[PDB]
Amino acid sequence: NLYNILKEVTENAGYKDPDRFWTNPNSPEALQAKAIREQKEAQPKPEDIKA
Amino acid sequence: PMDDEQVLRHLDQLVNDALDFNSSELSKQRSEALKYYFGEPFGNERPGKSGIVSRDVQETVDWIMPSLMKVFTSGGQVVKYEPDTAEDVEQAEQETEYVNYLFMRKNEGFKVMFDWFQDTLMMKTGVVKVYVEEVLKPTFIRKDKKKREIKVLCVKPENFLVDRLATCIDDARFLCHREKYTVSDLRLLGVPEDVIEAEANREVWASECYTLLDVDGDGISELRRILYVGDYIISNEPWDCRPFADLNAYRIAHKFHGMSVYDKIRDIQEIRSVLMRNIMDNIYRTNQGRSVVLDGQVNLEDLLTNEAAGIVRVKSMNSITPLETPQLSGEVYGMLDRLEADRGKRTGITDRTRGLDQNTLHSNQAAMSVNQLMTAAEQQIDLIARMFAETGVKRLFQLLHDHAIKYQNQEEVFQLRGKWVAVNPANWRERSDLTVTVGIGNMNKDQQMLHLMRIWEMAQAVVGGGGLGVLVSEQNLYNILKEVTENAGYKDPDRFWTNPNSPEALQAKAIREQKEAQ
Amino acid sequence: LMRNIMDNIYRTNQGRSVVLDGQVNLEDLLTNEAAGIVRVKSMNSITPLETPQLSGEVYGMLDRLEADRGKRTGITDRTRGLDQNTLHSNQAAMSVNQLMT
Amino acid sequence: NERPGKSGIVSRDVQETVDWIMPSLMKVFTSGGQVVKYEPDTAEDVEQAEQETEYVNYLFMRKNEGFKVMFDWFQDTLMMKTGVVKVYVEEVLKPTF
Amino acid sequence: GMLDRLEADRGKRTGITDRTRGLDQNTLHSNQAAMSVNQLMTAAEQQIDLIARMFAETGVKRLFQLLHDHAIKYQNQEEVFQLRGKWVAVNPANWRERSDLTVTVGIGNMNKDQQMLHLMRIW
Amino acid sequence: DEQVLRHLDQLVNDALDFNSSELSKQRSERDVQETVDWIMPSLMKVFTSGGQVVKYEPDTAEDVEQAEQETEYVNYLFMRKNEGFKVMFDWFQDTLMMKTGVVKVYVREIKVLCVKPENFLVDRLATCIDDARFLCHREKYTVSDLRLLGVPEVWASECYTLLDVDGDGISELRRILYVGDYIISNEPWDCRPFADLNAYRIAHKFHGMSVYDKIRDIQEIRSV
Amino acid sequence: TPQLSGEVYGMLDRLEADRGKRTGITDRTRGLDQNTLHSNQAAMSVNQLMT
Amino acid sequence: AAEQQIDLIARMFAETGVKRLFQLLHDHAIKYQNQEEVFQLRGKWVAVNPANWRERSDLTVTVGIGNMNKDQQMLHLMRIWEMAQAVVGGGGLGVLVSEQNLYNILKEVTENAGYKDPDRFWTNPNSPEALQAKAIREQKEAQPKPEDIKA
């Protein structure tokens, strides 16, 4: 719903779909981001030479 | 039932009546307005009196016009067809750029607006004419002949006769527009006798008539344009429409023509001129010395020193008396501030074309003194520009008429080389002016700082916690950067930083990311 | 009010017969309602013939009338915002909501 | 009530009121089609309400004589005390030829 | 303040608004570029017609004797900011924000960052 | 020596009725004595700085034919060769003084001549400044004219009008000099060596307005 | 002619102030703040003097 | 005071001195000598070859054109002072009457005092040192602001 806040802000600006999407509510790219791309960049990412 | 040779005399009778109807009132009004514009005397000046005149239309015109020039001529994106979305480059973008060359860079440039906007400001209306012309000079390899083109011009607005029951451009039962058409051009057209009249040009003023009648003895058909000479032999064919603009410029009620700043401000400038003339009278007459007679008889002091009061004081022995004739009040000069507020607030609220500072820098506190004081709280000039565009789209539509009829198989060079047949295009009869005028369309500074404060920086602040993984991708940020660069003056070449989406970027982006991830 | 102000200034700017009594029938009725310069009548001296000027306090109503001319529906000043010298400062909620719209 | 031979100056005051009332209505109503909503049942909105409200909007957005009609509304209301328009139906053409 | 009031055609018409003017000057320049350059077009037409074997002067580059196949004479030069109107919008923010929050030049930026010098170091 | 000659002579004689007899009043109303030095003298970079403001740029048929060579050659006449930078700004000076600037290309090579546009007599009504009813210019043309072929107080030349003096097939524009007892040489060209460029505020009239023209009241109000 | 007194304007002002005191209290009921702006000192002068 | 008769006397002697000043024109035209003056500068040239010109005017002395001391004092010191302050404040500095004319507008007081050259800095009729100082000021006050982002 923070994304809904941002989408309302952008609608106030006047950019619904193309320029400022800022919605990503539940979409396969958004699903793979929040559940995999963000998660695979947080849980298993700290495995560098420092680890 | 046949109606032949009667239309000649009928419109001959109509011309004089229409001229009596129009020129007596409207021509006199606009000519008086022009005389006011060029400081012709108003009547309050008398011999040995003031001479100050009213000169105020100049500054309001010179405050309104530059904004119109800076807002109109900006790229070739002024008018968008907005057709069905998928196939647009074939006609929606091709024909706009086609009319870009055939209107801009070919026909007088943006000076056409400078030759028509004043008509919408001085003449209460600006009405263009769209006319056919032919091009020549083949091989005399360039074996191309009889080229066709069409331009747009004035017809001396004093020569725009309209019927008495039209009130709209596409309602004129009678229309008349006349041009020079020298006698050598008549001989080019094979005129077989003399004219209405040492010089080949015998003062021939050819008249063009747009009227609908019944020559074929059938139902009332479309108008047939007539090229007259002296109320004589004609050239009539089934025509298409009226190639005109008719910018009322204020959208008055349903009348033939609209109204101008002249009709608004003639009386205000008249009272201003009267005030200045009376101020000069206070300076001049009220400050006259005389013979300085206490009472005296002296035949009214030698009849006011022979109606002059210049140099005489001999009455009998009169003592020192300045003889100060009573003068004007002190509020007359203080009335200047009130009347300046009265008139400047009408349409030129930006005193000296702009509102800015010299002592303190104009920062951007919050919402930019919101939206430029709400576009100076909806200045009427913006709405006048909106009406200008919404009615001048008719110019493009009239162009597209003849383009779809027949022009050429010409090729143009917008952003590339190689274009194709425009012999049989689609007009699409649908246009738009969304991002140019009163429509939401946040202005240059407004959009700039709005994006800077609430889009450019809010994202850069929120990215600290969540990150760009789900937030704005690179392509959208680059689109915002691209519009920012266009706000800097040039869309592409101002500040590239671009690389939005391409194998030279996206594939390069992936391979570079894996380069730094190994 | 504008008509009366302009007619006051017209009557004041117009000259007189420059006479106290005269014997030329008001100097030919002010030179046939003109009265440019005529003082030769009998013995009258050149006198500007002052006229009672109106009260300036009448102007004190015009601005009030200005308020009247907006008090009905549009007393808002010209509905055009101009900030030349001092910018639009805001403390909290923009003086809330621009004085509640 | 004009007296000839003197100043017959007529001060125009209504024009300012009308000409600064006009832009407010224009600015309010000349922005897309956000002005009017159809308010459907919560479960299904775009299926028949959003699409058809935007359809009617386009039938007033650039598919029917633009916004000069709105200006005529407002002029006829403010000046002649009442603004009225009519909505009629015409036939379309361009068959095979 | 009578003289100052009557000077509306002296100070205000002179394109002075406490340095906040010049639209009259810009309009005059654009009109001259669209009117005086017509004299240049006429001169070129006369040199094509009433002259032949033309040359070049003060540059010693190359003589254009003949073969003027075509010409589309028009100008566009009055569309620039005054001193920093086109820069102050994103002058100190692009380099200090785009590469600061996300220092990933190449993915999130471009080589045109060097062009920043062309707008900052150069000027 | 036909009726065309008499018509041209009468047109030249009656040309100066208003072209150079009433526009001079647009000179004084003074303010341009510093306003020009505040705008025109500082506009040196506006006119005489830049080769992109003056660009030909034709279509794909001719793109690298004379794109820069023509501009480079013309840049000589732009400054220091013929009608130089000061002489080109003389057009703006004449626009500030008599509400119109002139660059008259009177002519293998030509030069923008006829400075001091107060010598631009016309038929008192042009409305086009390119294709008017008639046009003229003032030249000295003294008696000592050994340079010219035959010419033996007298100041009259260049009677190039758009009237019916062509005699060939139509009322065409053939350039010729003044009569001078039949001393005019034909030249069938449409050069029309005149500009009449107001370049400040030019409507559909004979000529535009000057800086002092818009400040006529201020001329006697800012000093008197 | 017998000119009217200058206190008639005071009579107009008194009658207008009386009318305002009766029903239309707030002066013009409008806010035009271009140079003179409200200053926050305590709870917005609290609640604009309790409305 | 409606062409005071003292001002009449001054006007008519000012205009009748034109002939006796034509006499001095003739005296200069025939021959005097070829030295230099003693006013406004060090060094002047020879003007012993003039043209009679048959025309001379003395209209700048009295209530005629005549910018007399009373009118100059009052008109300048009140009206042109107010107008100059208005122009400088919000009327404009680089477009309207500027320093190059402010020197002239402020030299009027010095002319009333009689000293032209050595009192005020405001002369610059055509001065190279003032232009060089202006260029130096621009160079020394422009650079740091661009340099801040140039780093």
UniProtKB/TrEMBL annotation, chain C:
The chain holds residues 354 to 454 of 705 of the full protein. The lineage of its organism: Viruses, Duplodnaviria, Heunggongvirae, Uroviricota, Caudoviricetes. This is ORF.04. It comes from the Viruses. The gene is orf4.
From TrEMBL, chain D:
It comes from the Viruses. This is ORF.04. It comes from Pseudomonas phage PaP3. The lineage of its organism: Viruses, Duplodnaviria, Heunggongvirae, Uroviricota, Caudoviricetes.
UniProtKB/TrEMBL annotation, chain G:
It comes from the Viruses. This is ORF.04. It comes from Pseudomonas phage PaP3. The gene is orf4. The chain holds residues 404 to 454 of 705 of the full protein.
